């Protein structure tokens, strides 16, 4: 079994299509964001959104392969991070590149109490092959990092409540189930639309320290700050993973 | 279906929707640079050897850049497992190991960068929009670091902090999104065996094999490395590949002219 | 009362002196790349339509390519627009926007080099480290990003954050300062008519015309960013640009070779 | 009105020409900002001074566009940012680049109590066209930044007490009067020499945030502490700013 | 004399052949190297080791130049340093490469109490001619950088005792005389290996800072921390220069 | 005997022993660029003058490039002065100055970069992996910054803070690694004398001379730096240099063909 590189952090994801509701939705945010900065040491990475779906349109329809797509999309979720990190600046908040938070990460959180990044992996060319669509997301880059270093958890925000047996907003909006807790071989083996990427329950059964992660709804405040201690506010997703 | 289809979809699904993906699963394919081709050098197969071996292989890449574009990468060889029998035994998880060997990616393409500098030739930085080492009819190539740039984003194994992406795949991995015409794997053996080349039983040389046949004679990982079988079933451009004996003169040049020299590996 | 005089001004003087700055104004004018030319790909004009209007220019471009030198800017589009959109209503200043559509424009920059790699036209990693693709006249061509480096400081706008120097001005300037020959604005309009071309039954295009009647004219915004036209009374080296329509063939080559089409604005 | 993202911040700036002066200068200068650490969270950054006109000189006399001189002389005051940065190195300081200025500043200045940079702007190319001297200088790039990040005042640190109504050094001495205050408006109007870029006095009248800035003299002592107090020493200079 | 820059800097520098016995030797130093972090401000440098060795004999089999093989050992000093920076990241360290440790060191430090790098100097292809092996390896990178900052003192961590008059592990082993205090002086009239580079030896006689410089064995735990706060455990060397 | 033997001593050794530094002193040697030329524009002799100093040797770059494969090297000159005497009274190390002085003659390298991109002839970027400017017959040139990295790591002389090691050795470095057949070092005189050149009390011209000489006659540091006579006396594959005036039109060219005017000094 590895050791735990950070085994006090906690890494927090932030969805994209959150960041696109703009103002209503980041401005709540922030300020739950001010009131966790002295609870916890937090690495915050930002998901891509809509943007990131206007650049596959246009790329898809340009004919270009899913590896030309990666690192554009990849650039949304920097820019949802450049504005997260700026609206937390006057707090000691600044956006890091990919090889400040592979290398620096410790330096940097050990300077101040947090920081911004882009949760999309950089794979950039040489994304898998296969999907025309980019296989490994925000969801999926959070858990590889959070997971790498061992961290005590990840938390995922999203718009929705949690994860429901279908798109809660899409065609069967009514039809729509809760589950408060499911196990990532499960939700690999059910299909349809989920806020979560399909590599995230692929990366999760290779997963050695994180045993869950919760999806919560970062358009409830007090949610993620009840979620990063342990409340059940949302879904929880187990990793098959055991404690020791 | 004309104006567009998925200015509904793209902003109306999630991207793991079946119903989504289909639809981007039929769109325009391009391929970036359809007429290059991608080597692997192998890092422990051939340049590790030194002189001996690599001087010969380096004769042949100038004879072979007039006619063919050329995609060099280079492979991790000995020193990348000393870092992952120190790092492994301190316990570090494959995210920091990955990092480890494409440094010795780097050194071997340095290396084999130097040699081919007075042709023309560079290391590439801040490339794969530049096609101008690949266009110029003088060079028609350029020289690259096998390893995936996944550092800490590293896709671990089931088992085992060794990462499992490593220069075949992403010496692999460029040819597929480029839309190369070949992928060419260079190491040290004639190709793929029924048992371990150095030590077997019966062994007989297989000179073409698909995917799941090799799942089916337990040879998953054999020569390549055992996700790189699985991503080319998943590759759309490259369908196949060949490892070639570059030991053995000559052989580089003559798959290159699409000779069937070696073990050819096909996705379906 | 001469221009050699000046090392012996420049020790004594404040910079903002105007028997400095006057003094100044007489010297050597010499041109980087006088036989070059800057053309904008419009990120909402062109390239957020995709293959219909994209391809076409790709294939001039290319067909141009041999008779002149190409230094290839794009533009943001409607990715920037919601980047702003979101921004503004944050309460972010015109400096944080300005990196914020920097991006697209690195992105549209992107997916365009990959059209052209086959071609042998490389995307730049830095603006001035390569003269080089221009240099080869098998390559003769570049893609960069059109937006300007300003990024925090950027100057802010009369009123509103958005950014005022953008893509427009990011190519006029860089061929203001290069010695470059013509500025080609490839956008979807035919160029100028006196009201808004999506909405008018009434509006005269305008094939030429010069700023002062622009502005007098109360067109200070309708086809290029109200600044690059005090750009364009100020530029020493560009005294006029051309604004042509992508959506049409054959514009784009026609205006390389000199021809009045599209709206033609002057400096004087 | 947009919002102050470090309104914390004191932005402090020293003229090129005062590092020119060598260690007689510096010496007094380093010594009286190692006092204001810990009474502010100062940026400072650089001027370029004389060495920014011998490249003027011989980029002139080759006929270098502007465009191709400004980042020679930004060069200058990024130099004049390492040698500055060098003699309060022992307390925690350093020279940064204009990248991690702009993105990460938060972050080094939780780590430490100041920073190092250069004033100019990173316009190389896209200077502006017209003047054959770069019309954004050190002032002009130290002002912009500091209005960004909505800093509490910009302090100019020169070698001349302050504004005076001909330059008193050059042939005329007679006619020149001190302006102990100023208004950005009233100086666009009246011409001759500055110590200033006249195009500082550009982006003071679309100033959203900074009301104020004091130029106070380098070489006497306790200047510039008293100007970080607001105690007014030099020639101050009205924006525009207010309320509505 | 110049100034020292960092005067409260510990300079501590790691052999590469202590990092090659892995676990056994790494850990031991790990958790001596968590002790002394709240003791000292400490800069630890890694060598390259056996790896190093075996990119020579391809690089020297190829034909390669001396300027081609020092940035392929550097890099070797490099990932040494990146194995130490992660075992010790929940400390709050991490490797910086060459660039910062030459500009933002001081902040660097401020945020945390300690940092890696490459003891390796970046001559890379400017490395001198007349030796086909670089004529300046870790050692000499570590005690140049030592002596630039101005540092109290550089420490030279390896597997031996100190040194000895004949290789303790090479040739013959029944001459091999341990000194427990030598001279730069005496050392360069003795001509045979050493746990040291030639050129240190170099740097040494213009050293304008450190007047000593202590060998300890890594492999003993206790030694360092002991060595740090100039007690006696190895092999002292005198590099010719007074602040004694 | 068999290209075997060092490496188990490689293995097993100090590398301070001599058994393993002889059999690695005899090895291939491999020449990287021999087909290359070295060339110093100088900071103090060329650059700071501008415009009549530059034109000429611009002029003469060109008709050179097409017949040789030129590397051009910078100086810093009076702005390194400046910053030197800055620095220094303050006192700061060696160390620092190095990367001080790095800036003029990367602000040299950009000057001069910019009056030959019109001839395609770029600026080294990445730190000068890019090898294809050379090897294009087309361009055959490129343009770099004479000082080593060395910056902080300087090694200091026995006296003073100035860095012993500056553009005259770094320009001088690259030749020597990189197998180049000739170094020349461009400046304002036609080569040596014997005195400090400015009190000219009518000295003799040394057409020819040697390191060792050079230290007999107390021309010690004359013109090269101290330390570029002492990397001549250990340099392998550059076993002389060449010192030529550029005010005279044709001392450049005519130095390039290989011929004698101007100094030598020889590392025998
Ligand atoms: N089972 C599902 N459960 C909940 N939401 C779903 C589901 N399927 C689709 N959706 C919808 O998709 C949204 C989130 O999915 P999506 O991944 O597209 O956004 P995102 O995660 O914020 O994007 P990014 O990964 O770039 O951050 C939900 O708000 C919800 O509207």
Redesign the interface.
């Given at each position: 079994r590895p050791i735990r590189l950070l085994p006090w952090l906690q890494v927090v994801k932030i969805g994209g299509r959150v960041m696109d509701r703009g103002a209503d939705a980041i401005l709540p945010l922030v300020e739950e964001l001010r009131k966790l900065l002295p609870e916890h040491r937090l690495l915050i990475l930002t998901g891509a959104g809509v943007r990131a779906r206007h650049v596959f349109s246009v790329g898809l329809d340009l004919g270009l392969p899913v590896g030309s797509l990666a690192p554009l999309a990849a650039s949304e979720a920097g820019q949802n991070g450049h504005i997260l990190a700026a609206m937390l600046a006057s707090e000691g908040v600044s956006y890091v590149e990919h090889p400040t938070v592979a290398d620096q990460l410790a330096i940097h959180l050990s300077a101040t109490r947090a920081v911004v990044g882009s949760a999309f992996p950089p794979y950039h060319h040489h994304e898998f092959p296969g999907s025309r669509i980019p296989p490994h997301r925000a969801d999926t880059g959070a858990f590889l990092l959070a997971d790498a270093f061992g961290a005590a958890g990840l938390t995922i925000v999203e718009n929705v409540d949690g994860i429901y047996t279908a798109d809660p907003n899409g065609p069967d909006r009514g039809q729509a189930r809760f589950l408060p807790e499911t196990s990532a071989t499960d939700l690999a083996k059910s299909e349809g639309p989920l806020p979560v990427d399909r590599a995230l329950l692929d990366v999760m059964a290779t997963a050695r320290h994180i045993e869950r992660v919760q999806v919560v709804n970062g358009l409830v405040p007090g949610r993620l700050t009840a979620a990063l201690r342990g409340e059940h506010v949302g879904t929880l997703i187990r990793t098959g993973v055991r404690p020791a | 279906n004309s104006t567009?289809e998925?200015?509904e979809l793209?902003?109306?699904?999630?991207?793991?929707?079946?119903?989504?993906?289909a639809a981007?699963?039929a769109?325009?394919?391009?391929?970036?640079?359809?007429?290059a081709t991608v080597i692997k050098i192998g890092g422990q197969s051939v340049?590790?050897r030194?002189?001996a071996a690599?001087?010969p292989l380096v004769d042949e890449i100038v004879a072979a850049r007039k006619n063919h574009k050329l995609l060099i990468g280079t492979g991790a060889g000995?020193?990348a497992r000393?870092?992952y029998?120190?790092?492994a035994?301190?316990?570090?998880?494959?995210?920091?190991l990955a990092?480890?060997g494409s440094?010795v990616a780097?050194?071997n393409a340095?290396?084999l960068?130097?040699?081919l500098?007075?042709?023309?030739?560079?290391?590439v930085?801040?490339?794969?929009?530049?096609?101008?080492?690949?266009?110029?009819?003088?060079?028609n190539a350029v020289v690259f670091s096998g390893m995936?740039?996944?550092?800490?984003?590293?896709?671990?194994?089931?088992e085992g902090?060794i990462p499992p992406?490593r220069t075949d795949?992403?010496c692999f991995?460029?040819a597929?999104?480029?839309?190369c015409k070949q992928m060419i794997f260079v190491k040290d053996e004639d190709g793929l065996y029924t048992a371990n080349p150095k030590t077997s039983k019966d062994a007989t040389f297989i000179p073409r094999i698909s995917v799941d046949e090799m799942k089916a004679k337990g040879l998953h990982d054999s020569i390549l490395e055992f996700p790189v079988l699985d991503?080319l079933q998943?590759?759309?451009?490259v369908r196949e590949v060949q490892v070639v004996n570059g030991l053995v003169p000559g052989n580089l040049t003559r798959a290159l002219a699409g000779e069937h020299v070696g073990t050819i590996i096909t996705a379906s």
């Open positions: - | 567009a998925l200015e793209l902003m109306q699904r999630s991207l793991t929707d079946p119903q989504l993906q981007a699963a769109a325009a394919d391009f391929r970036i640079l359809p007429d340049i590790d030194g002189r690599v001087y000995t020193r000393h870092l029998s120190i790092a035994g301190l316990g570090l998880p494959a995210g920091v990092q480890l440094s780097d050194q340095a290396m960068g130097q040699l500098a007075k042709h023309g030739i560079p290391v930085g801040g490339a794969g929009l530049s096609a101008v080492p690949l266009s110029l009819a003088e060079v995936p740039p996944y550092k800490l984003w590293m896709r671990p194994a089931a902090v992406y795949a992403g991995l460029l597929e999104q480029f839309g991503l998943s590759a759309q451009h």
